[PDB]
Amino acid sequence: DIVMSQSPSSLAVSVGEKVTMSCKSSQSLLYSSNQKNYLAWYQQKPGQSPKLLIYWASTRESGVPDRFTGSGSGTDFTLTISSVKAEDLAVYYCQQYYTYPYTFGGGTKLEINRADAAPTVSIFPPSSEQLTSGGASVVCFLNNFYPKDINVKWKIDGSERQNGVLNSWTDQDSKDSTYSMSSTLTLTKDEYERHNSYTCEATHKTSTSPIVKSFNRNEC
Amino acid sequence: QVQLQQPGAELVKPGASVKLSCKASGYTFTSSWMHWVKQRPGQGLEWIGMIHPNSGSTNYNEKFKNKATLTVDKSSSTAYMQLSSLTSEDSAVYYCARYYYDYDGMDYWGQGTSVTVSSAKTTAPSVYPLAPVCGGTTGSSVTLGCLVKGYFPEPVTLTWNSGSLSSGVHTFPALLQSGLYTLSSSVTVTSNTWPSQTITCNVAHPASSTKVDKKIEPRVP
Amino acid sequence: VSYSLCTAAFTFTKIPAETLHGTVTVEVQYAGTDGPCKVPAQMAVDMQTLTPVGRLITANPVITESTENSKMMLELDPPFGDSYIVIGVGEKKITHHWHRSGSTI
């Protein structure tokens, strides 16, 4: 089996930067009989299957923009993105096809540095449907913020509650490179109906002050 | 257009076997080798092997030659992969792929089947609409949500208006809690779109063969 | 004394032939007049990737002539089972299906 090594394992780049990623093999992928390099590059965006970008080390797949260029020969290969776009957020894999079994590098995860942004916050009381089943989830969305780190607290009638909270972050957005996160506080219906004020309170690097959305079970 | 249709999910007991399918269209199935590739969550890619549908010839990665068996049915343009003795490290997405390294055809990978190796049973989700807090808003846009609670195994497919609503969507990765997954999604639309136009969260859970279309309706006192 | 690849079109001059121990000899002719150049040759099982299989035995096959349609002999070691002989590069490369029995060693 041929060993494929990629570096760096991750890189943080800004939109518009020219990015170079390396791929090395344990033996030459240049077949002297046809002078072709048996090296392909794949792109895998979050939640998608891999997509072929480059084969023969430098031939672009149809429909791939020419900002992607493959270069190198023998044991040393590079993939270059001439001016990175937000949509290029992905893991990039090289793969030798000089011998069976085909083998892949460990990938380079491309992350995007962008300007800091505070989240837009939205809060959602339990649905009537869920309440009929006996449960009560309160949901808070913190949307389109950067950087990724964010602290979320739930306050019930002013008291912090951490038990029963699930917090999930998206991958970086393919259009604006921000993150979003959802926080779900799950109670029983009976516990939910024993309190009035429900508050999602977040703290993010953009401000020491809390990012808040609230509702009162009482009101409309 | 090349299409490789793979079932979304298979739940498999530890140490058991599973047979995955890959139905091909949009190109001559019999004249292209069909490849299979494994990807564990958060990890890289491993080439399993390939089969030539016209002849039945196979080439396996030796790591998989005992635990994988590739077959095809030409009459239905379907490739199959049986995997045996599944370990916890075989919980992974398995892709079929038409490798094509030439100018006159498209390389194409299917969406993959998510195989979960677990002794737990299948549980279909509850799908709850998340309408805005009771009242109104001074904005020109509104954010709506959908909560997909208590399912196993992954994945679910969630779309808004069957995929026709794609801008302004954020779908949050599922989280496992007490053996069941929960996922949520938010969508932001212009305030005059809804509710005069219907906004529906469409949730499919392949492992339970369930599909729910949940309209988001305004709250009342 | 390193020559570039022959990039013009090849044509088989007769059917490839199996030797006593299961290799294959392949005679071709070359339409180019741009010799000297090296004949591209390999075995493959997958024409959509050209991953080499078996071995090229005549590993430095040089067309020395610049007259058109000159002839050259190659030898390859096929894998067991089915494969393709592939001569030349680019859109005019030529292939020939081959089957080697497990007993032919």
Side-chain angles (χ1 to χ4, degrees), chain A, chain B residues 2-221, chain C:
Chain A
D1 297 13
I2 292 174
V3 175
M4 304 298 299
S5 305
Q6 282 181 258
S7 63
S9 54
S10 69
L11 44 64
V13 298
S14 293
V15 169
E17 185 174 353
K18 174 178 180 187
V19 60
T20 304
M21 297 169 267
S22 297
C23 175
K24 189 196 76 71
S25 60
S26 54
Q27 63 184 85
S28 179
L29 309 184
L30 177 65
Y31 189 42
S32 49
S33 200
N34 59 22
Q35 296 292 305
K36 296 183 215 300
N37 284 286
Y38 282 72
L39 191 278
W41 289 94
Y42 291 85
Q43 179 192 55
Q44 186 174 34
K45 299 184 177 184
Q48 298 192 352
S49 308
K51 183 82 168 187
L52 180 65
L53 299 176
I54 302 284
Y55 56 100
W56 301 125
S58 58
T59 297
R60 284 204 323 290
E61 174 70 322
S62 291
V64 172
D66 83 333
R67 75 171 175 278
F68 292 93
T69 291
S71 66
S73 64
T75 62
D76 298 288
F77 301 90
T78 63
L79 179 65
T80 303
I81 310 174
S82 64
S83 182
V84 164
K85 306 249 185 308
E87 75 203 60
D88 299 337
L89 186 93
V91 181
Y92 294 85
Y93 295 97
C94 66
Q95 181 229 232
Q96 71 81 24
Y97 56 105
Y98 177 77
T99 58
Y100 303 110
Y102 293 172
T103 51
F104 294 85
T108 293
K109 180 178 180 181
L110 191 162
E111 313 204 82
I112 291 176
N113 185 63
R114 59 147 289 139
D116 290 359
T120 297
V121 59
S122 296
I123 195 169
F124 299 87
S127 63
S128 60
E129 292 88 343
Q130 184 185 25
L131 290 172
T132 63
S133 304
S137 297
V138 196
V139 178
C140 184
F141 296 128
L142 290 154
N143 287 341
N144 299 86
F145 62 87
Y146 190 91
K148 190 179 186 177
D149 280 346
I150 194 166
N151 171 257
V152 189
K153 297 176 183 182
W154 281 94
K155 311 299 188 74
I156 300 182
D157 290 335
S159 176
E160 189 168 348
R161 161 103 183 195
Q162 188 162 314
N163 191 317
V165 176
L166 291 176
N167 295 322
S168 177
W169 279 251
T170 54
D171 306 281
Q172 285 191 267
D173 186 87
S174 67
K175 280 149 187 170
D176 73 6
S177 312
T178 60
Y179 292 95
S180 299
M181 76 84 54
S182 69
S183 182
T184 304
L185 169 68
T186 295
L187 310 175
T188 71
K189 176 176 176 292
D190 287 346
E191 155 93 329
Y192 172 70
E193 301 190 332
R194 294 199 286 265
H195 302 285
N196 191 33
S197 168
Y198 288 84
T199 294
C200 175
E201 178 182 307
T203 305
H204 184 253
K205 153 180 195 166
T206 47
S207 176
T208 63
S209 288
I211 305 149
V212 167
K213 253 291 195 175
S214 301
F215 71 90
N216 289 332
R217 195 177 54 84
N218 225 101
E219 286 150 62
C220 191
Chain B
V2 183
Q3 281 291 284
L4 294 179
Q5 292 306 135
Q6 299 182 258
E10 290 292 349
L11 176 63
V12 185
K13 301 239 173 241
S17 299
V18 68
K19 193 165 188 171
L20 305 180
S21 61
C22 171
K23 186 173 181 70
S25 65
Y27 73 101
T28 300
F29 176 68
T30 56
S31 61
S32 277
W33 286 85
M34 183 67 76
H35 297 243
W36 297 80
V37 175
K38 175 182 169 178
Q39 183 168 43
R40 298 180 54 202
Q43 308 254 290
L45 297 166
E46 196 172 24
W47 185 83
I48 295 168
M50 60 179 198
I51 184 167
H52 188 264
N54 217 36
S55 68
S57 177
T58 55
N59 187 297
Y60 291 92
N61 187 330
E62 287 285 321
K63 290 175 182 180
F64 290 88
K65 199 163 71 175
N66 279 303
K67 68 191 293 170
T69 302
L70 304 181
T71 58
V72 294
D73 183 14
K74 294 156 52 190
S75 66
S76 68
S77 303
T78 302
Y80 298 98
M81 177 169 71
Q82 181 182 357
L83 296 174
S84 297
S85 286
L86 293 203
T87 78
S88 64
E89 294 183 332
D90 295 325
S91 292
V93 178
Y94 295 86
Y95 304 101
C96 61
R98 183 222 192 184
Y99 273 56
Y100 203 93
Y101 295 160
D102 210 357
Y103 77 105
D104 66 338
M106 294 301 298
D107 188 273
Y108 189 92
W109 293 43
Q111 288 307 288
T113 296
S114 292
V115 171
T116 294
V117 182
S118 172
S119 301
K121 74 180 185 58
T122 299
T123 300
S126 299
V127 177
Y128 301 124
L130 305 180
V133 291
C134 204
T137 185
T138 52
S140 62
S141 297
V142 56
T143 298
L144 303 177
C146 189
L147 177 63
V148 185
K149 190 172 194 324
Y151 65 90
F152 189 85
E154 296 204 83
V156 296
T157 291
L158 188 156
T159 61
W160 289 97
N161 287 358
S162 300
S164 63
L165 197 53
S166 57
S167 184
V169 172
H170 295 293
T171 294
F172 300 90
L175 291 178
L176 188 61
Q177 177 64 43
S178 301
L180 297 173
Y181 283 98
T182 299
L183 171 147
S184 57
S185 177
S186 74
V187 63
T188 298
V189 301
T190 54
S191 183
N192 55 333
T193 295
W194 177 85
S196 64
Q197 302 174 220
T198 307
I199 294 191
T200 306
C201 172
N202 317 101
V203 178
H205 182 234
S208 66
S209 303
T210 56
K211 183 183 180 182
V212 178
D213 301 314
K214 183 65 57 177
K215 295 181 284 188
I216 313 302
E217 304 293 350
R219 295 177 196 263
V220 293
Chain C
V1 70
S2 192
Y3 307 108
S4 60
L5 287 187
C6 302
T7 64
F10 287 90
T11 300
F12 296 115
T13 62
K14 58 178 169 179
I15 188 161
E18 191 177 48
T19 70
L20 173 62
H21 291 289
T23 72
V24 61
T25 53
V26 181
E27 200 183 72
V28 297
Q29 66 181 49
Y30 182 54
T33 58
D34 58 352
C37 55
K38 186 174 78 167
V39 182
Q42 69 167 110
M43 305 296 301
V45 295
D46 183 348
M47 292 307 307
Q48 289 66 238
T49 65
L50 295 176
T51 297
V53 296
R55 298 192 297 116
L56 175 60
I57 296 172
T58 53
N60 192 32
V62 175
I63 294 300
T64 57
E65 304 306 286
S66 55
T67 53
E68 73 175 0
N69 298 345
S70 73
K71 296 188 185 183
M72 188 50 174
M73 185 69 74
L74 312 158
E75 188 177 16
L76 305 99
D77 196 17
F80 294 112
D82 293 332
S83 66
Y84 297 92
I85 300 162
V86 186
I87 312 299
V89 292
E91 63 174 32
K92 301 186 181 305
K93 67 176 153 292
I94 56 175
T95 66
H96 184 83
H97 191 270
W98 193 255
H99 181 84
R100 176 179 191 170
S101 163
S103 63
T104 314
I105 66 178

